[PDB]
């Protein structure tokens, strides 16, 4: 746990910038302009969120049947590059 003036730079340089390209499939070289970078968040990164629910007979079913069997989801983009899978922990039953 770092100070905020030092931890900002550390955390920001702690992401993964991968370069990708597009191949000109005739010359089999990089298409002109076809070069870009994508930031990723490392695997095993942890985010914290809350799911709030207002009172209803459905909110009960949601919180007792849906959220209890909701473990893995896909977030964000670049899914076919295998870049979205996420586990949900539910502090309720982790802490």
């Amino acid at each position: 746990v770092l100070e905020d003036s030092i931890g900002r730079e550390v955390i920001n340089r702690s992401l993964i910038r991968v370069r990708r390209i597009r191949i000109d499939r005739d010359k089999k070289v990089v298409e002109t302009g076809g070069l870009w970078s994508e930031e990723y968040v490392p695997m095993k990164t942890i985010f914290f969120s809350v799911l709030l629910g207002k009172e209803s007979k459905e909110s009960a079913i949601f919180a007792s049947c849906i959220l209890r069997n909701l473990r893995y989801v896909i977030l964000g983009g670049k899914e076919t590059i295998g870049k979205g899978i996420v586990e949900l922990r539910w502090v309720k039953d982790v802490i």
């Binding site: 003036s5 030092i6 900002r8 730079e9 340089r13 910038r17 370069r19």
Partner: protein, 154 residues
Amino acid sequence: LYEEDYKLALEAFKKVFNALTHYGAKQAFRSRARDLVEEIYNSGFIPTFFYIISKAELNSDSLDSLISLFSSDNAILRGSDENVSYSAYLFIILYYLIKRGIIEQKFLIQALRCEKTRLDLIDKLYNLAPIISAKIRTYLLAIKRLSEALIEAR
């Protein structure tokens, strides 16, 4: 007497642009400006910075013109184009460090001049790392836009 990142980059690029006589030096500096920013991100500022210093081969006379560049608009970077480009990018970075008051000009000229002060510069850069990596990549993004704009692609 505060120049925003883009204004600072403009005034640095002006001297760097007038100091590169042969056009091939300018065209190589363009590629330096286009790749060294993501290098600075990936490998860190300090490693990339000493990498740039080494690729410049300051040569004790490239260094003297590099220093005259700070004073007068009449200076000129001489040497191989692929070395003069790295010396011009080193000037870019030093101009930032100096004008942002992060490191003093005398100390930087010393650490470039001879051997002992260089490791003290390494120490000082590790002390001043969060001050530098805070916003230097925006200044370098401006440098990269300017070099892509004002220098023809090879």
